[PDB]
Ligand binder design. Structure first.
Ligand SMILES: Cc1cc2nc3c(=O)[nH]c(=O)nc-3n(C[C@H](O)[C@H](O)[C@H](O)COP(=O)(O)O)c2cc1C
Length: 362
């Protein structure tokens, strides 16, 4: 089984290729990590296994979901440390995903009911709806288009949160630059309509992600930074006219950051729009990137084995199957049946129901 051949992810010696994909679960009440997160991540921790946390707030303006954790406060750092400890107690490697939603928010999630921030003043269309704190679905508002100074301050929020994650004991961080959120709102020419140095050309559209990644690299070292992108996923009206060139332009700047800093990133992480043409886009981005590649999106045990065996990826991250199967790594090793996941409790607040009560194998 190629999923269980060991892999050297830079400085981290992983024992298998099964990764916990980052998943927002909304149990971090009041943006503070709760003990429930500790039990949840510990249930899925394995010796030499790689975990990525739910999207974590870098700022008071970075949320678009309820009860999502942050790492911009000393209290959040203090509470994240107890979770990192129980995870490292089982020998797992864990990264904190740094998440800013951009325009994918609502006044209910913003301090003083302010408008969310974005590259543009264009809102998400009402084809998409935002989960409200009360379980209803609300309307995405008009965002505020920020100047270049405010762009540099957001880069600083990424930089400070990366240092906070290291203080909490995380082995590294993942930059969430996918799924139509803040960074992707700069990348995709379907969203980025700016006429300054952050809009227009493909080079200008990649400036924001380059500056974010360079800032966390120089802060904690390239070998502790992962980067997640999704060029071909139109989530939240996040289309690009040339998804492959967009992905290749992004990949090239990661390669240059590695050459500049003289060190390789932890990995590049790409979700795919889960047909053969979409598989070719992943392999094209894989072949272009000088380092570790993590593939994600609709993967199974068989597709994951097939990805690693054919060189399509070095690591495979699983989302929904990891919700319902805490011992997904053990089940996949034994080729044991997988349990179904409850969609209704993906984003609920209960610290147990649909979060930690999925049973292990008999
Ligand atoms: C409930 C849920 C929450 C998710 N939260 C995040 C997130 O916070 N950040 C992120 O980059 N991806 C997030 N994802 C996407 C996953 O990281 C991953 O791309 C996806 O689950 C892979 O598809 P799979 O379920 O077939 O494994 C989430 C997915 C689900 C189902």
């Amino acid at each position: 089984n190629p999923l269980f051949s060991p892999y050297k992810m830079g400085k981290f010696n992983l024992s298998h290729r099964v990764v916990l994909a980052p998943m927002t679960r909304c149990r971090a009440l009041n943006n503070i990590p709760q003990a429930a997160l500790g039990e949840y991540y510990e249930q899925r921790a394995t010796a030499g296994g790689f975990l990525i946390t739910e999207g974590t707030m870098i700022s008071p303006t970075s949320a678009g979901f309820p009860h999502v954790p942050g790492i911009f406060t000393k209290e959040q750092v203090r509470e994240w440390k107890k979770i990192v400890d129980v995870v490292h107690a089982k020998g797992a490697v864990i990264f904190c995903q740094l998440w800013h939603v951009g325009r994918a928010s609502h006044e209910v999630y913003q301090p003083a009911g302010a408008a969310p921030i974005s590259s543009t003043e264009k809102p998400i269309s009402n084809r998409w709806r935002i989960l409200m704190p009360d379980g209803t679905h609300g309307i995405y508002p008009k965002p505020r288009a920020i100047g270049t100074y405010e762009i540099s301050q957001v880069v600083e929020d990424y930089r400070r949160s990366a240092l906070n994650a290291i203080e909490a004991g995380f082995d590294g961080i993942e930059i969430h630059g996918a799924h139509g959120y803040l960074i992707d709102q700069f990348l995709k020419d379907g969203i980025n309509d700016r006429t300054d140095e952050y809009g227009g050309s493909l080079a200008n559209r990649c400036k924001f992600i380059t500056q974010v990644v360079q800032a966390v690299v120089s802060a904690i070292g390239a070998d502790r930074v992962g980067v997640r992108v999704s060029p071909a996923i139109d989530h939240l009206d996040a289309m690009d006219s040339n998804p492959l060139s967009l992905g290749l332009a992004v990949v090239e700047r990661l390669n240059k950051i590695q050459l500049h800093s003289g060190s390789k990133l932890a990995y590049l992480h790409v979700t795919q729009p889960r047909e053969e043409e979409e598989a070719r886009l992943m392999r094209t981005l894989r072949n272009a990137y000088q380092g570790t590649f993590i593939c994600s999106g609709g993967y199974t045990r068989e597709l994951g084995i097939e990805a690693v065996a054919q060189g399509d990826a070095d690591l495979v991250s699983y989302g929904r199957l990891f919700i319902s199967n805490p011992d997904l790594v053990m089940r996949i090793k034994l080729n044991a049946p997988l349990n179904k996941y409850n969609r209704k409790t993906f984003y609920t607040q209960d610290p147990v129901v649909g979060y930690t009560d999925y049973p292990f194998l008999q």
